[PDB]
Design a protein around this ligand. Sequence first.
Ligand SMILES: COc1cccc(N2CCc3cc(S(N)(=O)=O)sc3S2(=O)=O)c1
Ligand SMILES: [Hg+2]
Ligand SMILES: [Zn+2]
Length: 257
Amino acid sequence: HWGYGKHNGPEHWHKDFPIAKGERQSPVDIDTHTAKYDPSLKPLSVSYDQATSLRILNNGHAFNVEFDDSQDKAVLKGGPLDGTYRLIQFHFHWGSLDGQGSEHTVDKKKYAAELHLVHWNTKYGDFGKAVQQPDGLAVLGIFLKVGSAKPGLQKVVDVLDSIKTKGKSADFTNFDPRGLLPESLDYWTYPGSLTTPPLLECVTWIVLKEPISVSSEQVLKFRKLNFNGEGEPEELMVDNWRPAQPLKNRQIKASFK
Ligand SMILES: COc1cccc(N2CCc3cc(S(N)(=O)=O)sc3S2(=O)=O)c1
Ligand SMILES: [Hg+2]
Ligand SMILES: [Zn+2]
């Protein structure tokens, strides 16, 4: 199956998922100088006050916190979006070293990790239908830089022991995702795809300008996860990120100057 190793990594994906060579693939490098400031861009509206977290799980690719998306409990509106998008889950991509880990880069600069809050367009009924549409998903990308500890991230860090290997999960209720947002909601936006197979081109990427900082020990705990299931040879979960793809016939718009 696909993964991030030499034999099943990104450079092999196209064989099983041809869309990997598509026209709007992610991530991409955000070139601040050629990004077009757009005044008609509305401010972002993240309403996560009623968010209901359910569980956290290691899926062999990354760890994911799933939310109850049965109702409009945590939605994203505004920005370049037309419609309400529901939060279904969030996950991270991180590196084996502090200078790599994020998927999107800024002027070729890589961050230690990158948080993706995944939302789907409610006008489509369910996530399954949303992934069949060019505007089916909206992923909020947030960069993580090493520095001071991020208090809202510690709850996730503590529970990682219980989900060390692929297939493990644990109840993770009452988690407030607002604890992971930076102060400013300024962003960049462009049409892209999922960064892992099936690599579907249904995503409106909203990448925040301002990164959040997390301590080295917090990201350290991320690296102690396992790609493998229990009983198999241990393989540390690190560098679960895909390299930048060519922008092609696309323009990155900024909501700020
Ligand atoms: C039909 O397509 C499906 C069905 C079920 C699951 C998925 N996903 C897994 C891959 C993947 C990669 C994401 S990233 N890094 O681009 O945010 S979000 C995401 S997903 O929605 O959780 C996709
Ligand atoms: Hg799509
Ligand atoms: Zn992701």
